[PDB]
Every structure is written in structure tokens, then in C-alpha cells.
């Protein structure tokens, strides 16, 4: 049974948390709900590196800027629903970079209530799946080629 | 310019494992672990914390890579490696591990941030593909 001793170092501080977020390989954004729209108030470097948009053209603009795919229209809709209800959700989407090139990404959204200011914020995690998708497709082709 | 609770939630929601470690003598001691790291390795936070990084069983095929990591850590340098590791239950996973040094002169010591991304599916798909060409 777990009678484990509770552990965590109280040496950890907000400076180290910011470095974890800066070092994260996945993109990490924070968003707020202003009326009917979703506004990005924080983005980490990975988000820039994956999407090609800078922090400053993104910040405090509606997230509609990241161009979606029509094959994802249903998933897009599931996301807005969960956002309105403050429920979490996860979806794999084909999105478009600033230069219009496509990337596949798994997007996972967690709502969080802030203790200092009582308002509801949502945390996105943006995982590039492009390489997994591309490998799975090559394998599918080779199955047609070989077998 | 961002709340300290919100950063923690960012780290907690992460899919990748995120740890902090500090050098202690000959050891690199893990002082923080996020939930994804618990799930990736199969160990709970309280069984991981304050143990040397070698608690997580490695592969003999990685001995060279581990040596590079030791060197980078001793020198306070970042490094990145793909390793085969084994969970608490003994199942294997491939993971890309990226280490970022951070100096706190406040603490008079260098902290290390690992990012541990499970690459297992990428590795096995790549291996299947290698066969299909034979
Ligand atoms: Cl739409
Ligand atoms: Cl494509």
C-alpha cells in the first residue's frame, strides 16, 4: 500500500515555472473569454516556432486567426461548445501556419479558475503530430505497395 | 507578467514530462515532477522525489548517451538525447529528453529542467517502415 511520505521542494518558484514553460517542447497558450470571442493573453516560444506567428501579432487578438480546415469543422465546433461550457476537450486539427503551410496538431484545452482574480481562463497545449501523421501515411502507402 | 498559479497549471496540463533536478555531489536529485512525468514513468510523485535520476531504469545501449548527459550536467550545459527507459512495471518506452540549465544566483546553484517526450510511436513506426523497404 502507499503510505508514501508527501514530497515536493518548496525551493520551486515562479521563475522556474516560467523556464519550464519556456523550455516546453509543446506550444502553451493561455486564453480569456471576452464576450463571444476567445483572446490569447500568453504564448510560449514553441507556439511561435510551430505556427510562425510572433507573440506580439497574436497577443490579445481573437484565436480565429489560426486558419482551420473544413474537414475539421465538426471538431472546431466541439471545441467552442466545451469552451462555452467551461469543460475541457482535446482534438486533433489540421491548422495553417502564417505562411499557409499545413501542420497537424493535437490541441488540449483545460479551463482553470484563477484564485487571485476570479475569472475563468483556458490553457491550451499544442502538440505537433505532423510527423506521426506523415509516417502513418507512408506506412499505409507501403502496405499498398508491398502487399 | 503572469500569475504563479497559472504557470503551475500550464506545467500540470503538459503532455510531456517536466522535471527539475539539482546537482548534489555525484548525484542529480529530482526536486519537482509534473503529473505527465508520473504517468510516463509509472511512478508516483512521492516515490520519485528526492531520488537520483538513475532511479529510472535505462538501457545498456544508451551508455554512451548517458555519459554525454553526465558531462553536460557537470558542465552546466544543455543537452538532448533519445533514450530507451523502463517504467515501474518494466514496460519499455522511447523518450526524447531535453535538459535546460537555469542559474539561480538567489540559490547559488544551477537547476536543470528536463522535458521528457514519449517518442515510442515515432520510433516503432520508423522501424516498421524500415522493414517494408526490405
Ligand atoms: Cl468554424
Ligand atoms: Cl499535409
Author numbering:
A (entry chain B): -9 to 137
B (entry chain A): 1 to 134
Wording from the paper:
Light-oxygen-voltage (LOV) flavoproteins belong to the Per-ARNT-Sim (PAS) domain superfamily sharing the canonical PAS protein fold. Widely distributed in multiple kingdoms of life, LOV proteins control a number of cellular responses like phototropism, chloroplast movement, stomatal opening, regulation of circadian rhythms, photo-induced growth patterns and pigment synthesis. They function specifically as photosensory modules, typically binding a blue light absorbing flavin chromophore (FMN, flavin mononucleotide; FAD, flavin adenine dinucleotide or RF, riboflavin). Light absorption results in the formation of a metastable covalent bond between the C4a atom of the flavin ring and the sulfur of the neighboring cysteine residue.
